Symmetry: D2
Subunit: 119 residues, 4 copies
């Protein structure tokens, strides 16, 4: 149930394909909704999850560089798919920016995102 | 300088290719060193980093499932390459395990890894 | 507005006093609601927050040891108070368990809690 | 062995008292070394740690406000004391800044600190 369009709370959109081999490929759109705000996502998911009501572990990365903008940063999301009635991807993320060694201590933001298939 | 074999402190080995398009592909080996402990890694890196001594932002994901073992979990690393003399990848990571909703609060470990090209 | 009883989503209860000097003192109750599940909390908050609609930065620690139970672990919450109509404390937390050096890599859980004054 | 002066890699200094009741009190000095860069720290530690070579779980908070400067932010450290020969406190930390709801997603930095009793 991972393949599809997912929306976070903040209004970002993640279009993903889950391949039989464990590969995630797709696009992440920061909230705007134009070509300029689309970035390649790659990831991995558990292709053989536990049959006991456990969620499916997954993760993906976006480098914030496309043909229009380079933020010299990358976010990774680490999380799990929950195939509920209204399914959800619950994640925590790390956004690392490229820095000098002096600013390396303040390079990494952390947060959390919930995604649904409902805008 | 990202393409190559990298070793973490704990003795894990990351073989990676950095493609011109921002793609990372490769294998992550938990410390053992046999076929059974090899897992596909996919990621993204900043292909056009800042020319001011800033590091290169990157991230990658391993789902802990191969032909031999499934830990029903995924780690993402978020970090930066520093093209020093002895170059390094400084990361923080999140390891999410597939869980029940009741155990979802204790699903995610966080830590940090430094990688070098020197065993 | 920090002084009071706050409830997280999971059903834990935080009773806190915010002193004029920046001190937080109080008790954290894991969801049960008896004397056996009460632990001392200590923390700090910004006593002079920005007058521009910014939240108030705060943090606190619970060592999971009382007269009844010792989990040999400590959680810290780092967050901000938002004096809305229905006010909230938005936090992320780290739960570190005492471990051997060999298990030090898996010592630290991370997550997030929202607290309200409404059960 | 927690009571004493501890130095992080970056050159910050933590003077702490570990009380019999689980309380940490003290001062955190960002790297400078003058009165202007001293801040109150409060925390908790496991007063009865495991007798099996496990570290002692601890955590503390500094609100970045003193009589001289207010950064409208708070750091929490979550970690463990390891009573080695050369003892160490291994931590991960969260630095939350007070923000608007719009900037709440980028409010929280994460990192790691190792402390020793050796400058």
């Amino acid at each position: 149930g991972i393949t599809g369009t997912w929306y976070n709370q903040l209004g970002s959109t993640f279009i993903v394909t889950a391949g039989a081999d464990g590969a995630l490929t797709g696009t992440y759109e920061s909230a705007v909704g134009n070509a300029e705000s689309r970035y390649v996502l790659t990831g991995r998911y558990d292709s053989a999850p536990a049959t006991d009501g456990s969620g499916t572990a997954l993760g993906w990365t976006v480098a914030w560089k496309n043909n229009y903008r380079n933020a010299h940063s990358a976010t990774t999301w680490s999380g799990q798919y929950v195939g509920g009635a209204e399914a959800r991807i619950n994640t925590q993320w790390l956004l690392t920016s490229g820095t000098t060694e002096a600013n390396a201590w303040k390079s990494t933001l952390v947060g959390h995102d919930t995604f649904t298939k409902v805008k």
